[PDB]
Ligand binder design. Structure first.
Ligand SMILES: CCCCCCCC/C=C\CCCCCCCCCC(=O)OC[C@H](COP(=O)([O-])OCC[N+](C)(C)C)OC(=O)CCCCCCC/C=C\CCCCCCCC
Ligand SMILES: CCCCC/C=C\C/C=C\C/C=C\C/C=C\CCCC(=O)OC[C@H](COP(=O)(O)OCCN)OC(=O)CCCCCCC/C=C\CCCCCCCC
Ligand SMILES: CC(C)CCC[C@@H](C)[C@H]1CC[C@H]2[C@@H]3CC=C4C[C@@H](O)CC[C@]4(C)[C@H]3CC[C@]12C
Ligand SMILES: CC(C)CCC[C@@H](C)[C@H]1CC[C@H]2[C@@H]3CC=C4C[C@@H](O)CC[C@]4(C)[C@H]3CC[C@]12C
Ligand SMILES: CC(C)CCC[C@@H](C)[C@H]1CC[C@H]2[C@@H]3CC=C4C[C@@H](O)CC[C@]4(C)[C@H]3CC[C@]12C
Ligand SMILES: CC(C)CCC[C@@H](C)[C@H]1CC[C@H]2[C@@H]3CC=C4C[C@@H](O)CC[C@]4(C)[C@H]3CC[C@]12C
Ligand SMILES: CC(C)CCC[C@@H](C)[C@H]1CC[C@H]2[C@@H]3CC=C4C[C@@H](O)CC[C@]4(C)[C@H]3CC[C@]12C
Ligand SMILES: CC(C)CCC[C@@H](C)[C@H]1CC[C@H]2[C@@H]3CC=C4C[C@@H](O)CC[C@]4(C)[C@H]3CC[C@]12C
Ligand SMILES: CC(C)CCC[C@@H](C)[C@H]1CC[C@H]2[C@@H]3CC=C4C[C@@H](O)CC[C@]4(C)[C@H]3CC[C@]12C
Ligand SMILES: CC(C)CCC[C@@H](C)[C@H]1CC[C@H]2[C@@H]3CC=C4C[C@@H](O)CC[C@]4(C)[C@H]3CC[C@]12C
Ligand SMILES: CC(C)CCC[C@@H](C)[C@H]1CC[C@H]2[C@@H]3CC=C4C[C@@H](O)CC[C@]4(C)[C@H]3CC[C@]12C
Ligand SMILES: CC(C)CCC[C@@H](C)[C@H]1CC[C@H]2[C@@H]3CC=C4C[C@@H](O)CC[C@]4(C)[C@H]3CC[C@]12C
Ligand SMILES: *[C@@H]1O[C@H](CO)[C@@H](O)[C@H](O)[C@H]1NC(C)=O
Ligand SMILES: *[C@@H]1O[C@H](CO)[C@@H](O)[C@H](O)[C@H]1NC(C)=O
Ligand SMILES: *[C@@H]1O[C@H](CO)[C@@H](O)[C@H](O)[C@H]1NC(C)=O
Ligand SMILES: *[C@@H]1O[C@H](CO)[C@@H](O)[C@H](O)[C@H]1NC(C)=O
Ligand SMILES: [Ca+2]
Lengths: 681, 671
């Protein structure tokens, strides 16, 4: 029946770092007129405002807080605008049992219920940008994100929150940086670091310097994606600034195509709020009340926050409603109004007003992207229901978002296939001839001509040629045919077949030449014992090589062979191998031993060139063979060592040497005897 | 007519910092009563009303407001201990025209006279130890020190101010670290840069962790010196929770810095009582309550107000409400002009900061002890010359004094091997004379004499080579060293090639004659091949001297004397392939000669009467050459033993082949 006054203590910043009050005062003084004339909201009590100009200064705001608290009438709530004054009043209020309600306090520190037990704010914390960003990351599959920030408490707290926000979603912040006024060295570290998804937290003035340093560094383009804050002016990169040498068009090149996030401080739809107003009607009525133009009035995009804050306080008072007897020493009314506020949910000019557990308002975030020197809204995000409305109006260079990092396709260099096939066919044909000459020699062992020459030694030579020819099959094949698993048996078969082939094939010839030489200065006992000793020494050396240092697959890496006219993913080639752990030292003793043996064989075969003995008839032809063998072996011995890389040429040299040696040895030894047995019968 | 002083400070026994607020209440009552006795502010009298803040920002602000409302009009604010309340009050002081004078706020933040224009303090800020520490670095000439800071704004301010304090001086911060919970990582990081003197900024709890971390890295003892804060509690190392005895070991020698509680000068103060008399008065009056370091800083505080108010009365007070601006400005100037000797030393303010004393202490075997003190008003340092003790003789050095000495070949070993070489060369010269003298005789005529003389020349050249390749490069200059590295290669190659060409040509012709002038053509062809190889080696890429630096192993003292053995090899850019081809070309020929000698050891030709012993000679040369080359390349790092082995190999090989070839001839001719 009686309309009793209920006073609000409001601190409006009329100047300072954030002069939001110039539009925040009328937006409140309008809202009260809407809350008072409505007889269904608070029919008994009438809301009023006793406000003071804080100037966004704690030192100047403390005196006015004292003037409010220690002067009648009694205030039921406070309203600090700026962040620092808001923190001071939210810390001091609990001694008087007063709820604090802010509209423009965006510091993340104000969500600490231990220091500020009775604080609420309609303006969401800056940390609200984080749940959107991570979602966008999951929208495009980025997991390596670097961060650059300006040394300030708000951006620092935002980064500390973002670390734990990205930890939950399984993302990694690889590289972090900071700078007070000059961003040169952090952007240089970023460009060195090769960071793809960069999140930058800095003001507008530092933003221009940062992006012109980026234009110098060329940290823009296709690969690099940037996340910035979105409450700048629209043409910030086109604002003239003499502190930057980088020019306007260079900034249009650099900044263009970056993503920005900003809290939606006005309902995008055309619905009506509880005040029976729309967004456009509210803006019209406000600019009617404003004494200056909206672009000049400070805090114009914050005024709906003040309107919804007054409406939330009105609804809280209406829920509780007993309010005529508020004293600073009663906590009951404070807890009741707290429970009224904490349970707030209503549709105002800025949208759905609901406060989280820590008193911060949960609201939409608009995600825009700079296209063609202007901003185009690409999406909206609601973190409460975690719903991401997409308009499909964003753009990227290759039609898709850039990748979070370069993937490295490991390609495998395989030996050519036609080469391997041709050489294998040649080696098989050669093995066929070893079969023919072997059988021919074994059949005619009763004849006297072949009886004179040592036929078992020529048979051993043919067997050695056959084994060395068959060793070309495993020595050619690589992972293309074997795969990772069976490869060690392949390397072992290569080693053993080649070793025993050389052992028999050359031991028979060296034994023939030695035992002609020793006779020049005869019975088969020692002739067989000699080849026995040689093959045994070879087998023991190879067995030591096996037991001590068995061979195995080992991959060799190469330099990045990027293909052009394609996407930024480096191709890296690997050349398979298989080697003992110390193979140079191991094959060293073997090559030295065999080389000394071949050289001594050449010398003995030359020393016994003209000598003639009946029990070894073919020995001179053997002399013609050893030379070729030795020569090929020498010319093929270090070359394959030199050409470890370039697997194709190495296989060509090695296998052609093997084939030529085997063919020439089989011809020189067996052709003359064959034609002498043919033509004479 | 009372003059009120709004004095804010914690008093409740529940708050932890209460020992501050009560601890200075005796000294305050010491000053005030004195001011009431001597009658300085007459007719006015000082009346200090006390107010509790409880070191909570809300309760402090409420106490401040209750003081402003329910109390008489106070003239000045006094007190403020914990930084939050004092900051919130000092910032808003300008709204009531009240100047504040604190005695316990140590935050550097209150130095900004644009934000806190009315705030003064008689206690030095936390960063005042920086201009002191700097002078100490100038005293011991420590120019390389690393900083280890705790990740807190309180110590981060001191760490950041240290950089601006060292600026413009000859001090370099070699390593900067910051830590929050585990300092050991930053400890090993600091040790990575080879720092010896560290400047740590952290609380008491982190102190034990950082000191055990220094224990682990052996960052203690002789060569290391820590500089840490000194306001730690006494016996702080004894905290139940790292080993204890190891803790007392690693802590020993660290230097702590703090502010001086009372002036050490025995001079009369403004009140007419020396600091020791005031100390005794305070200790008597505070009979129950425990002492606080800030007690003197409260005493002068009252004086800093009292004299100030006197100057205020000089300029002209009951009229003062909190609206009076000119009176506030007058009192501000009067406090700014404060210059007088009090119990804590000279009291003078520079931009609202007290210009005071710093105290340096050091741990000794159980406890901390004063070692020095710095006067910031005179910017001078005064160290008690004797009480400072160091494990080593002198203060440890900042950087490592590494002297790259050059490893040398032993002089006696070189001299004895040289004497043996001259003896062997005299023997070779005697054998050559014996050969040339008996040339007409038949038995010397049978064995090829020219080849034997070529063998003597080979041995003699090898001996000169053994002179050469032990010069060590320390005896001679550098350019002479490179020229001699080339000369010794020439001389050894020629002396080996001729000496073995003779023994190879002889066995070759023995073998050839058994199978069925020119010998000199054989040796000449070998010489031509070696000459072509050497001239190619010299013209394409000549040998140059290079220095190898080893692992810095030794420390032959209790000093910080760390020497890197600088050894000296003369080698080519691709010298591996050159040496490989030379060794292979000669080893194949040695094996060839050995095989020929074994083949023909049984043949007897009168045209070469000494083929048999030449067989054993070529065996000697081959075996000794293999052993010498292997043991030479296997011991590149040790010059002495390698030179001894190679010299003995050359000497024994050459002398034994010369003896084998020439002795039987003389045993026959002399008998
Ligand atoms: C499984 C391994 C296979 C090896 C096969 C062995 C083949 C060897 C063949 C030829 C061996 C002879 C061939 C000689 C050609 C090489 C001479 C190069 C000289 C040179 O420029 O120096 C380079 C290098 C630097 O190293 P460094 O350590 O820094 O030296 C500086 C040390 N400082 C103290 C000053 C710091 O020194 C060397 O080459 C070391 C050479 C050792 C001597 C060789 C042995 C001589 C033997 C007999 C001498 C002959 C006697 C003659 C008989 C007389 C008959 C009567
Ligand atoms: C004085 C200086 C030199 C003297 C030496 C002279 C001659 C050699 C003497 C004896 C050789 C005997 C056995 C071979 C021993 C081990 C084989 C190695 C294991 C392996 O399997 O081969 C490893 C890497 C793997 O490298 P990779 O991964 O690139 O291969 C993948 C390709 N797809 O290959 C290579 O070494 C290339 C393979 C080495 C080839 C050696 C050349 C032999 C030439 C001709 C043979 C003549 C036959 C005699 C018939 C006589 C009839 C009377
Ligand atoms: C690296 C080179 C030098 C090693 C060569 C080893 C040579 C010398 C070995 C291998 C085979 C050996 C022969 C094996 C068989 C016999 C028969 C025996 O009743 C007398 C020894 C004799 C005749 C051996 C002589 C030495 C020999 C020829
Ligand atoms: C009769 C037989 C036993 C004599 C054989 C002589 C052998 C032992 C000699 C001749 C060639 C020499 C090799 C020459 C080259 C190299 C490559 C190097 O990176 C490791 C040492 C190594 C591998 C050497 C080891 C010893 C070696 C293999
Ligand atoms: C370790 C290797 C190089 C040893 C092999 C050395 C070779 C090159 C030696 C061994 C036997 C030598 C041959 C022996 C005898 C003759 C006949 C003579 O009227 C002309 C030189 C000639 C033709 C020699 C040429 C060089 C030769 C072939
Ligand atoms: C890597 C290099 C050093 C290896 C070369 C090895 C040399 C010594 C080999 C390769 C070719 C060989 C020659 C091949 C052909 C003949 C013809 C024959 O009727 C006499 C021996 C003779 C003349 C050989 C002597 C030795 C020889 C010259
Ligand atoms: C450097 C040193 C080791 C070289 C010394 C060379 C020595 C070994 C030579 C020089 C003179 C030689 C002596 C000459 C005379 C004779 C007398 C004869 O009836 C017995 C042998 C004997 C005793 C010789 C033995 C060897 C000998 C002592
Ligand atoms: C790889 C390296 C070790 C091979 C070096 C080859 C050497 C041994 C060759 C090159 C020149 C050759 C000499 C050239 C001239 C002749 C004259 C001939 O009537 C006897 C052999 C003899 C005296 C040769 C001996 C061997 C020789 C010295
Ligand atoms: C290239 C050089 C180093 C190889 C030298 C190999 C030497 C050591 C070879 C060549 C001839 C070989 C000899 C050949 C014949 C016999 C007779 C036999 O009943 C005992 C072993 C014995 C006595 C051999 C011992 C080793 C031997 C002397
Ligand atoms: C200081 C030590 C290591 C040097 C040793 C040098 C050795 C290798 C020399 C010294 C005496 C030499 C021996 C002299 C006598 C003979 C007898 C002859 O029928 C076979 C060779 C043989 C057996 C020689 C082989 C090499 C030999 C043993
Ligand atoms: C490069 C070096 C290691 C090659 C030298 C090989 C050596 C070990 C060879 C070459 C000549 C050989 C000697 C030849 C002659 C004989 C006489 C015989 O009744 C006993 C073995 C003995 C004493 C041999 C021992 C081994 C021997 C000294
Ligand atoms: C410093 C060392 C290596 C030098 C050693 C020198 C040795 C090799 C000398 C000293 C005494 C010499 C012996 C003296 C006497 C004779 C008798 C003669 O009819 C055959 C040679 C023979 C048996 C000599 C062989 C070589 C010999 C043993
Ligand atoms: C105000 O409170 C009354 C009491 O229940 C309620 O009926 C009314 O809906 C409230 N006003 C609004 C706008 O919700
Ligand atoms: C607030 O609390 C005081 C003391 O408990 C009490 O006297 C007063 O009635 C309370 N106010 C209301 C509206 O109940
Ligand atoms: C409202 O207060 C209750 C009481 O603690 C709390 O459990 C609840 O979470 C608050 N409301 C919201 C939306 O957090
Ligand atoms: C205080 O005095 C000092 C020197 O006496 C002077 O530099 C400073 O400006 C003064 N501060 C004032 C007048 O606020
Ligand atoms: Ca925008």
């Amino acid at each position: 029946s009686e309309r009793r006054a209920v006073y609000i203590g409001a601190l409006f910043p009329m100047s300072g770092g954030w002069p939001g009050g110039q539009a925040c005062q009328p937006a409140v003084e309008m809202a009260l007129e809407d809350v008072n004339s409505r007889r269904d909201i608070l029919p008994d009590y009438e809301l009023k405002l006793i406000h003071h100009d804080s100037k966004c200064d704690p030192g100047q705001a403390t005196k006015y807080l004292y003037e409010l608290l220690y002067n009648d009438p009694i205030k039921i709530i406070l309203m600090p605008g700026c962040s620092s004054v808001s923190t001071l009043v939210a810390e001091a209020a609990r001694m008087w049992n007063l709820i604090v309600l802010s509209y423009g306090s965006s510091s993340p520190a104000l969500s600490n219920r231990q220091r500020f037990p009775t604080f609420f704010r309609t303006h969401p914390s800056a940390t609200l940008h984080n749940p959107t960003r991570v979602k966008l990351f999951e929208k495009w599959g980025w997991k390596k994100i670097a961060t650059i920030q300006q040394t300030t408490e708000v951006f620092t707290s935002t980064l500390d929150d973002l670390e734990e926000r990205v930890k939950e979603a399984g993302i990694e912040i690889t590289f972090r940086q900071s700078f007070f006024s000059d961003p040169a060295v952090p952007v240089k570290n970023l460009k060195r670091q090769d960071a793809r998804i960069i999140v930058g937290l800095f003001y507008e003035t530092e933003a221009r310097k940062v992006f012109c340093e980026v234009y110098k560094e060329r940290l823009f383009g296709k690969k690099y994606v940037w996340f910035l804050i979105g409450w700048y002016a629209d043409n910030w990169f086109k604002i003239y600034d003499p502190s930057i040498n980088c020019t306007v068009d260079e900034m249009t090149e650099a900044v263009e195509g970056h993503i920005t996030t900003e809290i939606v401080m006005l309902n995008p739809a055309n619905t009506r709020s509880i005040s029976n107003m729309t967004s456009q009607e509210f803006v019209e009525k406000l600019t009617k009340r404003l004494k200056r133009h909206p672009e000049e009035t400070g805090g114009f995009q914050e005024a709906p926050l003040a309107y919804d804050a007054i409406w939330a306080l009105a609804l809280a008072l209406n829920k509780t409603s007993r309010l005529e007897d508020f004293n600073y020493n009663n906590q009951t009314i404070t807890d009741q109004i707290y429970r009224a506020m904490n349970s707030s949910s209503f549709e105002g000019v800025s949208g759905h007003v609901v406060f989280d557990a820590s008193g911060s308002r949960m609201a939409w975030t608009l995600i825009e992207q700079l296209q063609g020197g202007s901003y185009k809204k690409i999406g909206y995000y609601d973190s409460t229901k975690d719903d991401l409305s997409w308009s499909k109006t964003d753009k990227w260079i290759g039609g898709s978002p850039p990748a979070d990092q370069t993937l490295v396709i490991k390609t495998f260099r395989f030996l050519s296939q036609k080469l391997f096939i041709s050489v294998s066919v040649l080696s098989s044909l050669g093995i066929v001839l070893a079969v023919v000459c072997l059988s021919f020699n074994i059949y005619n062992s009763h004849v006297r001509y072949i009886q004179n020459s040592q036929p078992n030694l020529n048979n051993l030579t043919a067997v050695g040629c056959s084994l060395a020819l068959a060793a070309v099959f495993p020595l050619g094949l690589d992972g293309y045919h074997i795969g990772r698993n069976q490869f060690p048996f392949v390397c072992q078969a290569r080693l053993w077949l080649l070793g025993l082939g050389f052992s028999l094939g050359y031991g028979s010839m060296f034994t023939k030449i030695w035992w002609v030489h020793t006779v020049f200065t005869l019975e088969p006992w020692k002739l067989y014992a000699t080849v026995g000793l040689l093959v045994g020494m070879d087998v023991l050396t190879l067995a030591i090589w096996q037991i001590v240092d068995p061979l195995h697959r080992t991959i060799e890496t190469f330099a990045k062979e990027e293909p052009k006219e394609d996407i930024d993913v480096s191709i890296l080639p690997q050349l398979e191998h298989c080697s003992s752990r110390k193979m140079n030292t191991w094959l060293g003793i073997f090559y030295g031993y065999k080389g000394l043996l071949l050289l001594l064989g050449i010398f003995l075969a030359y020393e016994t060139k003209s000598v003639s003995t009946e029990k070894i008839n073919d020995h001179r032809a053997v002399g013609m063979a050893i030379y070729n063998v030795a020569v090929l072996c020498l010319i093929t011995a270090p070359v394959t060592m030199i050409l470890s890389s370039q697997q194709d040429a190495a296989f060509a040299f090695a296998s052609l040497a093997i084939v030529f040696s085997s063919y020439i040895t089989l011809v020189v030894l067996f052709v003359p005897k064959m034609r002498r047995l043919i033509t004479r019968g | 007519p009372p003059l009120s002083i709004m004095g804010l400070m914690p008093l409740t026994k529940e708050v932890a910092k209460g020992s501050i607020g009560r601890g200075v209440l005796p000294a305050v009552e010491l000053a005030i009563e004195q001011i009431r006795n001597e009658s300085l502010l007459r007719p006015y009298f000082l009346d200090l009303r006390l107010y509790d803040t409880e070191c909570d920002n809300a309760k402090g602000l409420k106490a401040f407001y209750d003081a402003i409302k329910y109390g008489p009009n106070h003239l000045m604010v006094f007190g403020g201990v914990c930084p939050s309340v004092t900051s919130i009050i000092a910032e808003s002081l300008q709204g009531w025209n009240l100047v504040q004078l604190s005695f316990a706020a140590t935050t550097p933040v209150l130095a900004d006279k644009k934000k806190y224009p009315y705030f003064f303090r008689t206690v030095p800020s936390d960063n005042a130890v920086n201009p002191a520490i700097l002078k100490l670095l100038k005293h011991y000439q420590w120019k390389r020190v690393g900083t280890l800071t705790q990740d807190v704004q309180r110590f981060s301010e001191v760490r950041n101010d240290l950089t601006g304090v060292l600026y413009g001086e000859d001090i370099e911060i070699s390593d900067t670290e910051s830590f929050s919970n585990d300092p050991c990582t930053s400890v090993k990081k600091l040790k990575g840069n080879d720092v010896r003197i560290i400047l740590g900024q952290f609380d008491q709890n982190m102190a034990a962790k950082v000191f055990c971390c220094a224990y682990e890295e052996n960052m203690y003892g002789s060569k290391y010196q820590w500089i840490i804060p000194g306001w730690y509690e006494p016996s702080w190392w004894e905290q139940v929770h790292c080993l204890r005895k190891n803790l007392l070991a690693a802590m020993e020698g660290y230097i702590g810095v703090d502010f001086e509680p009372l002036s050490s000068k025995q001079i009369k103060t403004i009140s007419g009582k020396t600091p020791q008399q005031y100390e005794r008065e305070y200790n008597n009056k505070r009979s129950g309550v425990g002492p606080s370091k800030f007690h003197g800083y409260a005493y002068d505080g009252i004086w800093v107000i009292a004299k100030t108010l006197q100057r205020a009365m000089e300029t002209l007070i009951q009229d003062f409400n909190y609206t009076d601006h000119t009176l506030g400005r007058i009192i501000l100037n009067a406090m700014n002009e404060t210059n007088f000797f009090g119990v804590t030393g000279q009291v003078v303010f520079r931009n609202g900061e007290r210009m005071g004393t710093i105290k340096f202490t050091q741990f000794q075997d159980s406890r901390e002890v004063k070692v020095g003190e710095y006067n910031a008003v005179a910017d001078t340092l005064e160290i008690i010359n004797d009480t400072i003790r160091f494990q080593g003789s002198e203060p440890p050095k900042d950087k490592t004094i590494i002297l790259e000495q050059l490893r040398k070949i032993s002089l006696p070993l070189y001299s004895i091997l040289s004497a043996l070489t001259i003896l062997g060369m005299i023997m070779a010269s005697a054998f050559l004379f014996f050969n040339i003298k008996n040339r007409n005789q038949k038995l010397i005529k049978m064995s090829s004499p020219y080849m034997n003389n070529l063998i003597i020349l080979g041995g003699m050249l090898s001996y000169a080579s053994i002179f050469l390749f032990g010069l060590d490069g320390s005896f001679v200059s550098e350019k002479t060293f490179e020229t001699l590295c080339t000369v010794r290669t020439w001389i050894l190659t020629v002396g080996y090639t001729t000496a073995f060409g003779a023994m190879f040509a002889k066995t070759w012709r023995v073998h050839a004659i058994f199978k069925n002038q020119k010998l000199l053509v054989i040796v000449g062809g070998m010489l031509l091949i070696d000459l072509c190889i050497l001239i190619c080696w010299q013209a394409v890429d000549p040998l140059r001297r290079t220095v190898e630096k080893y692992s810095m192993e030794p420390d032959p003292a209790g000093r910080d004397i760390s020497i890197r053995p600088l050894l000296e090899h003369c080698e080519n850019t691709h010298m591996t392939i050159w040496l490989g081809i030379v060794y292979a070309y000669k080893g194949l020929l040695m094996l060839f000669g050995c095989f020929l000698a074994w083949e023909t050891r049984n043949v007897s030709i009168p045209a070469l009467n000494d083929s048999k012993y030449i067989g054993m000679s070529v065996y000697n040369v081959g075996i000794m050459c293999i052993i010498g080359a292997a043991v030479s390349f296997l011991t590149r790092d040790q010059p002495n033993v390698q030179f001894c082995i190679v010299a003995l190999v050359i000497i024994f090989c050459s002398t034994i082949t010369l003896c084998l070839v020439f002795v039987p001839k003389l045993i026959t001719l002399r008998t």
